[PDB]
């Protein structure tokens, strides 16, 4: 009849109805009542006279702050009583003493600060008690003394500081005890005395500075947890008095040294996780314990694994031994249940074929950051299914393929000196692979090092038009440079400054011509097979030599242009006639070019970035400093060149032959501008270029100045024909 709901099986629910007092008019025969989420501030004297047959009473969240001592009188049959989330500042000592048949009492989530001495007296049948999320400052020893029949006590989230001796002496029937999230600092010697039936003990999030010696008085422990504490040592035989332990939580502590036989004779332990125990030297002497499923030791100084590991631990499934100083590996035969093996960041230096022999149910193997120097061919043959296998950052000259046809994810990152390549005919199921060197994945599954259009496995160039243009440019440049050099050298015993500069430029173009010829020959050799050659080029000195030659040719061309501009400026400003100075400048141009080339040689990994050997490959150059400085100097030289040439530009000496020189300088500057700007593309994200297109553009820009200059000189200088005719006398 009340505004709240009802139930057929003698149950009444009135949660969240906003009641201020207990509901009236309900049936006298009521077995359960719920008044939880109403706003009731007090229970009067005669509150529950109309419900003599109550068995369950709920008042959680009522904002209850007063209980009359006679309010609960007459509820002799009451069995469950909940009062959490109210504002009871203290335990209701007088109110609840009449509940003879009470079995469950919830008082958590309150602001309890004091417990009267005579509290809980007369509660013979009490079996469960909540006191969590209160402001208690010490264990209520005497109030608990009146509860011999208690089965589950929890005192979490309080401000307990220390537990005195014989605190729970009379609670012989207790089987669950929670004490986490307290500020406990010290445990007395006999604090847990008489808790012979305790099965779970929780001590997480406390401030224990030393391991609790009291747990030696617990003979029936099954679960123990003391993580998030400040414990640093588990001296020896700490769990000697707990043969039945199954689960231990100790994985968040400043652990530094756990005893050699700390975990010893624990025949029912399941998981053993120790992290950061630096001072540990030997393997834990965990004899007797033969029921392990996970064994994790990290951050220690363990130098060896015992041979008897899983011939004893036949149930072992996960074995993590990362970090540490494991140098040798004992044969893992008998490890039939091993699913995951982790040995990363160790001193393992080889895997003989007898190491991983005999394992069937293996699933993941980790060997990263080790010093593995060699693996025998059949070392991986014996194992069954494999899904992961990491050998990243080791010294593997060779890597066998037999027995890894079932492999799924493979990681060899950083395995430099692993030159000889893999093949897809054995590795069939992979779709995850990352390899050292470069373009090892041209045969292959999503490959991490996929760099298509940069170092294709098919051929260096690929485009027929690009290859034909490169070959034609190389041949024309070679012929023109040879003819010009021969003519300049045979012209006379003495060469005018302009003639010397022209001869120097023609000689310098020879470097670029040779580089282009070498690139064309490599592409021809790599036609349809470039991939295999690729690494050979990158690892081999050929690519570095080609890149250095290209850089030197560019520097020599820049130096020759600068020398010509300086001579023109001196002529237009003065005459100096410093032939010795001109020779010195010509000689020092070679020194500057050599310095520029050695700049990429002092650094490592510069020329190997791409098969083209270009100083500015796709993406930002790791050697940002020198790479940017060279381009900046090359661009800035144009400012001086323009300042010098302005005198002739305003009148557009150029009277004899300067016309060809100016055109050559302009063409060289224009060709240099695109390639130079491409090096700064990574900084300016607004500009993006496709890999193949960028590669072709760079290749075409590089040869053009050498392809052009001889033609612009001979084809635009009548002095060329004059010298040819004069030197023809040597032929006759």
């Amino acid at each position: 009849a009340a505004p709240c709901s009802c139930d057929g099986d003698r149950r009444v629910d009135c949660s969240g109805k906003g009641l201020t007092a207990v509901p009236e008019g309900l049936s006298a025969f009521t077995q359960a009542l719920d008044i939880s989420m109403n706003n009731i501030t007090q229970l009067p004297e005669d509150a529950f006279k109309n419900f003599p047959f109550l068995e369950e009473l709920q008042l959680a969240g009522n904002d209850l702050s007063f209980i009359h001592p006679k309010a609960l009188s007459g509820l002799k049959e009451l069995k469950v009583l909940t009062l959490q989330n109210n504002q009871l500042k203290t335990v209701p000592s007088e109110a609840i003493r009449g509940l003879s048949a009470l079995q469950s009492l919830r008082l958590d989530a309150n602001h309890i600060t004091s417990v009267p001495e005579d509290s809980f007296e007369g509660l013979v049948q009490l079996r469960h008690l909540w006191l969590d999320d209160n402001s208690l400052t010490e264990v209520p020893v005497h109030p608990l003394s009146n509860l011999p029949t208690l089965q589950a006590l929890t005192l979490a989230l309080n401000k307990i500081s220390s537990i005195p001796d014989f605190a729970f002496t009379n609670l012989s029937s207790l089987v669950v005890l929670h004490l986490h999230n307290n500020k406990i600092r010290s445990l007395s010697q006999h604090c847990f005395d008489g808790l012979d039936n305790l099965e779970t003990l929780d001590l997480n999030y406390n401030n224990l500075g030393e391991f609790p010696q009291a747990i030696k008085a617990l003979p029936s422990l099954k679960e123990l947890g003391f993580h998030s504490n400040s414990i640093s040592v588990i001296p020896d035989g700490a769990f000697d008095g707990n043969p039945l332990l199954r689960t231990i939580h100790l994985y968040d502590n400043p652990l530094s040294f756990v005893g050699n036989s700390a975990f010893h004779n624990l025949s029912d332990l399941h998981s053993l996780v120790i992290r950061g125990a630096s001072m540990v030297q030997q393997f834990p002497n965990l004899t007797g314990t033969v029921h392990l499923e996970s064994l994790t030791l990290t951050g220690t100084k363990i130098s060896s694994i015992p041979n008897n590991l899983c011939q004893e631990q036949k149930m072992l499934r996960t074995l993590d031994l990362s970090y540490n100083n494991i140098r040798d590996l004992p044969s893992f035969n008998g490890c039939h249940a091993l699913e995951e093996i982790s040995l990363q960041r160790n001193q393992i230096y080889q895997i003989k074929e007898g190491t991983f022999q005999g394992l069937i149910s293996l699933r993941i193997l980790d060997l990263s950051r080790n010093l593995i120097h060699e693996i025998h061919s059949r070392a991986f043959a014996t194992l069954g299914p494999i899904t992961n296998l990491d050998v990243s950052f080791n010294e593997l000259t060779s890597f066998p393929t037999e027995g890894l046809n079932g492999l799924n994810q493979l990681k060899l990152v950083g395995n430099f000196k692993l030159k000889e390549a893999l093949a897809a005919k054995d590795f069939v199921n992979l779709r995850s692979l990352s390899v050292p060197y470069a373009y090892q994945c041209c045969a292959f599954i999503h490959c991490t090092p996929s760099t298509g259009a940069f170092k294709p496995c098919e051929y260096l160039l690929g485009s027929w038009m690009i290859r034909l243009t490169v070959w034609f440019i190389f041949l024309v440049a070679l012929f023109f440079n040879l003819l010009v050099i021969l003519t300049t050298f045979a012209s006379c015993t003495s060469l005018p400054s302009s003639k010397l500069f022209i001869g120097l430029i023609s000689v310098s173009n020879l470097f670029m011509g040779i580089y282009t010829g070498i690139l064309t020959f490599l592409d021809a050799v790599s036609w349809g097979r470039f991939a295999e050659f690729g690494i050979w080029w990158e690892t081999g000195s050929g690519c570095k030599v080609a890149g250095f030659l290209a850089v030197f040719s560019s520097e020599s061309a820049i130096f020759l242009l600068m020398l010509a501009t300086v001579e023109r400026s001196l002529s237009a400003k003065d005459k100096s006639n410093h032939l010795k100075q001109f020779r010195v400048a010509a000689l020092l141009a070679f020194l500057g070019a050599t310095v520029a080339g050695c700049f990429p040689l002092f650094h490592r990994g510069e020329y190997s970035a791409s098969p083209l050997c270009l100083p500015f490959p796709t993406g930002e150059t790791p050697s940002l400093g020198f790479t940017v400085t060279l381009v900046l100097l090359n661009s800035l030289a144009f400012l001086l060149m323009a300042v010098i040439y302005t005198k002739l530009y305003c009148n557009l000496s150029q009277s004899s032959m300067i016309k060809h020189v100016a055109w050559l300088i302009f063409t060289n500057c224009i060709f240099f501008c695109p390639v130079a700007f491409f090096s700064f593309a990574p900084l300016i994200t607004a500009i993006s270029i496709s890999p193949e297109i960028m590669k072709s553009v760079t290749l075409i820009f590089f040869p053009l100045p050498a392809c052009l200059n001889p033609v612009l000189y001979v084809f635009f200088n009548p002095k060329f024909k004059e010298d040819w005719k004069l030197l023809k006398r040597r032929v006759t």
């Epitope: 209701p92 000592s93 009267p116 509290s119």
Partner: nanobody, 109 residues
Amino acid sequence: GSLRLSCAASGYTYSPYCMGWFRQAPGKAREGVATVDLDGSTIYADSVKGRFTISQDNAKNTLYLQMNSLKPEDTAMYYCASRTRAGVTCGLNWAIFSYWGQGTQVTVS
């Protein structure tokens, strides 16, 4: 105001173990005012340390609480409470008392 807040115990006469005065603001919890035990030891609240004074006439069970110079915060309903057995320490805790009175009103304006 010379406000005498008297009490009277009508059940039994022989000295109960502890007798206190408490107060309640409308709708809030019961916090103590004063307590006195069989030996005559006396306890007061911090806000009550000086203004009030708890007395007793044991032979007659008339237990007064004297208030003077009442603060405006002192508007509440006051309860006289008692306890018989000795199994607790005396103090301003509402959960130890066994018998509670109907209380009265003191409106300080």
